[PDB]
């Protein structure tokens, strides 16, 4: 009579040192993993519940304009720099990482009706109610010098 | 955001490469661990060159 039995060699299945991590053999026989359809339905339902719990969209609010905001322009080269224009006539440059205002300029009298950035990113253009088109330099004025178009 | 940084030290000059980073939310309590934790820092920053004095 010839016979072998199912005898797992323990060294193949037990880790060797405490620094080692446990071994995990995997078997994908469907008999071992039943109820696949009801099971995944529960997992999907849990995921939708957690998505509603963790939905927190508001991040920050930036303050400093003294009249309502009217224009927005993003910087082509930098993610964290944005430009805004208010109805009183001021233009403000913001740092998104720091959530503060970098510069303030009295660009126009009346509203500012539009603002656009040159594709290189070293200048931007603005339009106001004083029937004027002005070109500014993206870099801030040096020292205490008043900023000039 | 792939860019190179030059770092000066008393021992020498170091040139490093940055792979990716969350720029806008970098100074936020959970995202800031990208630079604070050494394991996360290694994933996004590499040392490409070094010249000792």
């Amino acid at each position: 009579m010839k016979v072998k039995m199912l005898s797992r060699n323990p060294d193949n299945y037990v880790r060797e040192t405490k620094l080692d991590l446990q071994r995990v053999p995997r078997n994908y026989d469907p008999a071992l993993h039943p109820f696949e359809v009801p099971r995944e339905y529960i997992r999907a339902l849990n995921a939708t519940k957690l998505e509603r719990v963790f939905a927190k969209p508001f991040l920050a609010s930036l303050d400093g304009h003294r009249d309502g905001v009217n224009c927005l322009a993003k910087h082509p080269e930098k993610l964290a720099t944005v430009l805004s224009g208010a109805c009183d006539g001021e233009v403000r440059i913001w740092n998104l990482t720091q959530r503060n205002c970098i510069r303030t300029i009295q660009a126009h009298e009346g509203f500012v009706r539009g603002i656009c950035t040159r594709f290189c990113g070293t200048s931007f253009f603005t339009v106001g109610d004083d029937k004027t088109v002005k070109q500014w330099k993206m870099d801030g004025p040096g020292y205490g010098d008043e900023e000039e178009p | 955001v792939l860019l190179h940084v030059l770092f000066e030290h008393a021992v020498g000059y170091a040139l490093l490469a940055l792979k990716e980073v969350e720029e806008i939310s970098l100074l936020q309590p959970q995202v800031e661990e990208s630079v604070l934790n050494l394991g996360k820092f290694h994933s996004i920053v590499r040392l490409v060159a070094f010249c000792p004095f």
């Binding site: 082509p76 080269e77 993610l79 | 955001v1 792939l2 990716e20 969350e22 720029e23």
Partner: peptide, 12 residues
């Protein structure tokens, strides 16, 4: 990629 600016499609 988290920090990279995405530009519009260009002919290529």
């Amino acid at each position: 990629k988290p920090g990279h600016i995405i530009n519009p499609i260009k002919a290529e």
